Amino acid sequence: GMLWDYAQPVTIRFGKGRAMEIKDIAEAMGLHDGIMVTPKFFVDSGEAQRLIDASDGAVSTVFTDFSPNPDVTEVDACAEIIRKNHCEFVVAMGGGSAMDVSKAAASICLTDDSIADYHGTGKAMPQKHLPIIALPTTAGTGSEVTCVSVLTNRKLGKKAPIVSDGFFPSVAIVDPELTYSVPPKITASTGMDVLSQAIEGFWSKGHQPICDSCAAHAAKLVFKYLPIAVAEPHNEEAREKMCEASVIAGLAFTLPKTTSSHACSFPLTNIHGIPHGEACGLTLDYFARINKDAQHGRVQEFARGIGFKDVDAMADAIHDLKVRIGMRTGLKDLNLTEEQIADLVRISRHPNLYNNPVEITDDMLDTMYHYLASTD
Amino acid sequence: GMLWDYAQPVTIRFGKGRAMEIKDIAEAMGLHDGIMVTPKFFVDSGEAQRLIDASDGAVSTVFTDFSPNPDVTEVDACAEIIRKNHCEFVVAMGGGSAMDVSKAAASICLTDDSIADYHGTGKAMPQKHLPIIALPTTAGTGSEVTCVSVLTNRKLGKKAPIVSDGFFPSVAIVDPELTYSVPPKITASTGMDVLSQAIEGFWSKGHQPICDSCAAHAAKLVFKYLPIAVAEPHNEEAREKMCEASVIAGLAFTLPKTTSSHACSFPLTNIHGIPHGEACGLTLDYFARINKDAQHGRVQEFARGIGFKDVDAMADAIHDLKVRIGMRTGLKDLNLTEEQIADLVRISRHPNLYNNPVEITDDMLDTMYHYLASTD
Ligand SMILES: NC(=O)c1ccc[n+]([C@@H]2O[C@H](COP(=O)([O-])OP(=O)(O)OC[C@H]3O[C@@H](n4cnc5c(N)ncnc54)[C@H](O)[C@@H]3O)[C@@H](O)[C@H]2O)c1
Ligand SMILES: NC(=O)c1ccc[n+]([C@@H]2O[C@H](COP(=O)([O-])OP(=O)(O)OC[C@H]3O[C@@H](n4cnc5c(N)ncnc54)[C@H](O)[C@@H]3O)[C@@H](O)[C@H]2O)c1
């Protein structure tokens, strides 16, 4: 017997030049006076003002004060702006960081309580929220189809996600044109994040068939088009394909969740400043050679479906992919101490690690990090 | 570039024995007193009361007065029942016929007009309705994840579908136990209906990547388990695997729509009484040999993705599948006249026919129908 649930209530509009259709959603939903949460890059580049003028007065205010690693203070700061201008909907035009505070601010601006009162403290988020129109500009994190908002508390040293049914965006416009301006180094990291969510989402203990079809489709696209997009940022086909894999791979991690590589990326990112997708890719092919034979050859069928002889052949491609696009293949330059390696193992015992098809023991993490700390 | 919209607002609770969870959905929504629209077979078998008592007062009334091809009068008869008993939600436990009157009667009971006032005339349905909990009992048509309600106007001699966003069921519980009681002949016909909507849904003109990932997963499951479900009606795994492919193929054809085998199946059913799934599969392999080199080798990559050397190897698998499960391979026993063959050509020119990649001219229809008239 196989039991599973599937819920995906985010409408998706895909196509180049469809970011101008924000006026079509604010008129159909009957919503005026919107706030666009976008990084300051799009403000100085005129791309933000181009869509606001196209919306024809639908969007009024703009909020750009937030970090790539967003804090709980920028969420309440964005919530205060919504409370003042009486904003009805929230536009999230950015990467995984601009869309993280948009989900949190749209639900918290309807209460007089801080966003910290629900940040990993057991308190459930109020489901009442403003509508969200996610416009991802990186390909990506797939956050435009998830109910997750990853935040940080600098004054309290806390960093934990918040999962609420009210964080689901109503509409998510995936425009590949907004990804043209992504630098090659970020394109490679965000591309590895798509590949990690696709592979981890498949071999997860909470897998389901609808997510597997999306996971296999997105993974094959990353192996083919991601090197092209890194080398050629203006390649319209390679960018559009990466957006295709990005939103589709997001549909494979919302329910089955992620496993080992995402559990190890949290210490590799927060402690050592390694970007998220690059930290996940740092251990992707490592756990692949471990889970290759689990689930009665199910992972072997995944590799053959995307065009590989075995899983070890697929793990070789993941390694050749990271080298060609300039991603980390080791941690020898960090000069990690035995205390730091032991810190990597203790913090890697995350709830996501238990979703791995093969039980990862502490002796395995100690072997992996000692191998990573001794590799260029 | 690629342009496509994706909207799947149905919640899928898949699992063996999860039909008892009507109480959970009614309690979570805080709803009581529901009307269960089901065929009379499930009442005579006690399966309807097993779920009424499992809901523990959540479901109160039962409606069983509708034909396999549902008439508008049977909808208003069910609508007036909800008006006289004020039910709060609709339970659709049955085939496509039961899930097509549950969509119309849930929206028309809130009004005072007849459901025929929106049947083919073009008048939009009111977007206010009662919640729908779809419990499909075949595998299938996927009506639990679509917004179309195929009806029939017997007094007016018309059979036209109705498409309304308010017809989307809230939750679609897919339980393979409800399919154990399907006779092998109906299993084979409904089984071919899944493979049709998957193959047609893939090579359609309005194809999109999310639906194509689902189309390949569903098609690969039918080739392996459909003969098992036919020769072994109580095979639990074969039944579950057919239920899995049926709901996944529902998401595959709801947006890209159907192509030629569905356009040719409508005259094969209303005039000659051939079941829908059997009438679709009667021409499915014929159009495959036409669309093999279409869309720049796209259908070729589809056949290799599911495990065939080419479409020709897949077309042979379709033929051998129908012979093993006892589906029509020709129309020689009908002894069709030259008038009848030309009558099938006229009616087969349906709007869904133009969705085929290769153009289906009237001469190709005349050639195909004359070929089937000479085939056993
Ligand atoms: N919410 C979720 O479900 C989810 C899932 C995974 C990761 N995340 C979090 O999301 C963040 C990652 O998001 P990311 O992977 O998009 O990077 P990002 O958006 O965090 O930061 C990327 C940087 O690129 C800059 N940039 C320059 N030109 C750009 C352009 N043309 N388009 C977009 N950005 C441009 C942005 O200003 C930003 O500083 C991490 O903090 C990660 O933890 C969230
Ligand atoms: N709305 C949609 O998305 C969609 C898609 C395809 C077809 N359809 C329509 O739906 C109908 C076809 O649905 P179907 O293929 O289920 O045909 P159908 O609805 O006739 O199947 C129901 C019949 O199956 C028989 N049956 C015997 N044992 C059964 C059992 N144990 N469980 C269920 N039924 C049993 C009964 O006679 C019952 O009337 C047609 O009217 C077709 O046009 C709708």
Author numbering:
A (entry chain B), B (entry chain A): 0 to 375
Provide the authors' own sentences about this structure as they appear in the paper.
Here we report the biochemical and structural characterization of this M-ADH enzyme, which we refer to as BkTauF. Each monomer consists of an N-terminal domain (α1–α5 and β1–β9; residues 1–178) with Rossmann fold, and a C-terminal helical domain (α6-α14; residues 179–375), similar to other structurally characterized M-ADH enzymes.
Crystal structures of BkTauF, both in the apo form and in complex with the NAD+ cofactor, were solved at 1.9 and 3.0 Å resolution, respectively. The apo and NAD+-bound structures are nearly identical, with RMSD of 0.37 Å over 375 Cα atoms. The electron density is well defined for NAD+, which is bound in a configuration similar to that in other M-ADH enzymes. Out of the four monomers in the asymmetric unit, only one contains the catalytic Zn(II) ion, coordinated to Asp192, Gln196, His261 and His275. Although both NADH and NADPH could serve as substrates, the KM for NADH was ten-fold lower than that of NADPH, suggesting a preference for NADH as the reductant. The position of isethionate is constrained by the requirements of the M-ADH catalytic mechanism, which requires coordination of the hydroxyl O-atom to Zn2+, and hydride transfer from C1 of isethionate to C4 of the NAD+. We identified Phe252, Thr257 and Phe265 surrounding the active-site cavity as potential substrate-interacting residues. Activities were almost completely abolished in the T257A and F265A mutants, while the F252A mutant retained approximately 28% of the WT activity. Determination of the crystal structure of BkTauF in complex with NAD+, together with mutagenesis of active site residues, enabled us to better understand the structural requirements for substrate binding and catalysis.
